[PDB]
């Protein structure tokens, strides 16, 4: 109630070499109305990308019903789609991470896990590996919360701290003679970019039995991921990169992430608000905030970002009709390499 500051630990190896590190902290629930115009304000604003604090157009989908005072089910309900402006959300632009490495700029953004009335913000910070030599403690302000960035130098030459051991993610012929496999944590963000090489759902159609025709008119872009808190960015999907296809499988087989609430009912919404017909299927629920409320509409080459507090967007692709893809995804993938 009075406790408002949280620590965000970011681990650093002793030796530093396109590598970016990531830290995150899940903040306590805050009222949904107070998340409007909420933007991260960091002390170290002298070296952060200026585009994250800019406005990204979202289609907001909420549900609201009427029920008896002691009832969990609803006598009636409806959904409302509105165009809202959200700043500071984890909308990464094309080559923003690469430009930030050569520019020594941080990426500070947040994810939103909301029900109909409250939101759990998850604050992320992506810094180049060059931020692990100075290891200067930074301060980020997000709404009513204060976050202290704490850099800890793990005991490993370049690798990842995994269960008290140091694992270096890798290969090829050398791997056959000897190798080891480690389960490594990964965070992914969808980068919306039009392009003949970024037609993502052409590979969704090939990897999965998903009956998905007319991939030309579906969202274009890729996911960018940082593994072990220290690696070069992995572009997802990449057909000849088995690590990339492992992340690709986890994103679309476990779209809500790898980690009570009672379903009130399915609903459809117009995305964007100006759409002539319903374009997105969702499931209205009651329950404490759980999974991310941020997603991107599937059936639009230009990314239509959706914010659906209290609704679970259609993430299945057995029918690409009125579906969505997650904005963020966290999970574990198995990587070859060695311990040091």
């Amino acid at each position, epitope marked *: 109630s*009075l*406790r*408002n*500051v949280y620590d965000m630990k970011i681990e650093c190896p002793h030796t530093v070499s396109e590598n970016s590190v990531i830290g995150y902290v899940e903040l306590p629930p805050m009222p949904l109305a*107070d998340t409007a115009q909420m933007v991260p304000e960091s002390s170290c604003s002298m070296d952060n990308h200026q585009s994250i604090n800019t406005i990204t157009k979202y289609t907001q989908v909420i549900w609201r019903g009427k029920a008896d005072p002691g009832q969990s089910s609803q006598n009636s309900f409806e959904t409302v789609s509105t165009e809202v402006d959200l700043k500071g959300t984890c909308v990464l632009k094309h080559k923003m991470v690469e430009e930030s490495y050569r520019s020594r700029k941080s990426i500070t953004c947040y994810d939103l896990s909301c029900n109909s009335t409250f939101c759990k913000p998850t604050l992320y910070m992506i810094v180049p590996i060059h931020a692990c030599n100075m290891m200067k*403690s930074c301060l980020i302000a997000l709404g*009513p919360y204060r976050v*202290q960035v*704490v850099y800890e130098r793990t005991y490993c030459m370049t690798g990842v701290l995994i269960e008290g051991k140091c694992f270096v993610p890798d290969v090829s012929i050398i791997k056959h003679g000897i190798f080891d496999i480690a389960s490594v944590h990964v965070v992914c963000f969808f980068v919306a970019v039009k392009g003949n090489t970024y037609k993502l759902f052409e590979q969704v159609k090939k990897s999965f039995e998903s009956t998905c025709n007319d991939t030309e008119n579906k969202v274009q872009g890729y996911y960018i991921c940082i593994v072990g808190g220290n690696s070069a960015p992995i572009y997802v999907p990449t057909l000849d990169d088995f690590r990339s296809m492992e992340a690709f499988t986890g994103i679309f087989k476990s779209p809500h992430g790898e980690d009570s609430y009672s379903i009130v009912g399915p609903a459809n919404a117009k995305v964007p608000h100006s759409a002539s017909s319903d374009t997105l299927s969702l499931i209205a629920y009651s329950g404490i905030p759980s999974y991310s409320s941020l997603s991107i509409l599937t059936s639009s080459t230009d990314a239509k970002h959706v914010f659906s507090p209290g609704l679970f967007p259609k993430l299945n692709h057995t029918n690409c009709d009125k579906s969505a893809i997650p904005l963020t995804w966290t999970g574990m993938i198995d990587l070859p390499g060695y311990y040091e």
Partner: antibody, heavy 118, light 111 residues
Framework: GQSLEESGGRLVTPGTPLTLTCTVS????????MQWVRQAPGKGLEWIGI?????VAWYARWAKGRFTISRTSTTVDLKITSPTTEDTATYFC??????????????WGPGTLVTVSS | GQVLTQTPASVSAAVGGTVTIKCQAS??????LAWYQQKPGQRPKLLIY???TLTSGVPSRFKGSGSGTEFTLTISGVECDDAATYYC????????????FGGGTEVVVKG
């Protein structure tokens, strides 16, 4: 029995760097966030900045570049880089009312008086 | 950046009567508002943290209320000891803030 006591208030000519110190009794300084607040005679309370347990200082928009807040094991500092006659006030030191918090501040020190004139 | 506005600048209340002073925020501060009492030549004294929670030793004659953008402080059965200047302070956000305290309100007790 927690208390604070500022030190260093004195008469200085304009432009002369001045540092104010806030000694702490009755509690561990490592567990609380601290703030400096000044009050010109007859005027209202003016927030200056907050120093968090991680050592980073967060200042008010007008105070940016004119003040510096720093933290040690047992003291909290406030340096006026180049005082002007408008800086004459009583400067207060305040502990955050609870740990891991910066919402509200208690207890307060008696304050120390800074006078800037030729 | 939130700006706290207090009205009126000065109020006069009779001994044993009731006085109400208001604090207004430019942007929402939810429940993170506080009320300080300060007498001349004395350090600020915290009376209410959060919207309506009294600190230890503060009489029940002091109560606070409000949420989001409008807050009030009321003193019932005001004594001569209650004559002071009262400041509201928000702890919701310190980003782009010129002053976490409002302009203050002095209450004169009519004896």
């Amino acid at each position: 029995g927690q208390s604070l006591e500022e030190s260093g208030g004195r008469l200085v000519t304009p432009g002369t760097p001045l540092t104010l110190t806030c000694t702490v009794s009755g509690f561990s300084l490592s567990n609380y966030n601290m703030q400096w607040v000044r009050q010109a005679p007859g005027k209202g309370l003016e927030w200056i900045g907050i120093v968090y347990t991680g050592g980073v200082a967060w200042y008010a928009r007008w105070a940016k570049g004119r003040f510096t807040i720093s933290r040690t094991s047992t003291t909290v500092d406030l340096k006026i880089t180049s005082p002007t006659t408008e800086d004459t006030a009583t400067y207060f030191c305040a502990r955050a009312y609870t740990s891991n918090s910066d919402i509200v501040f208690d207890p307060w020190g008696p304050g120390t008086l800074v006078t800037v004139s030729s | 950046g939130q700006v706290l506005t207090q009205t009126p600048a000065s109020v006069s209340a009779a001994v044993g009567g009731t006085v109400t002073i208001k604090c207004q925020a430019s942007q929402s501060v939810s429940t993170a508002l506080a009320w300080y009492q300060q007498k001349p030549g004395q350090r600020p004294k915290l009376l209410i943290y959060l919207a309506s929670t009294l600190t230890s030793g503060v009489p029940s004659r002091f109560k606070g209320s409000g949420s989001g953008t409008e807050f009030t402080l009321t003193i019932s059965g005001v004594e001569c000891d209650d004559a002071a200047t009262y400041y509201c302070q928000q702890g919701y956000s310190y980003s782009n803030v010129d002053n976490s305290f409002g302009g203050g309100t002095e209450v004169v007790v009519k004896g």
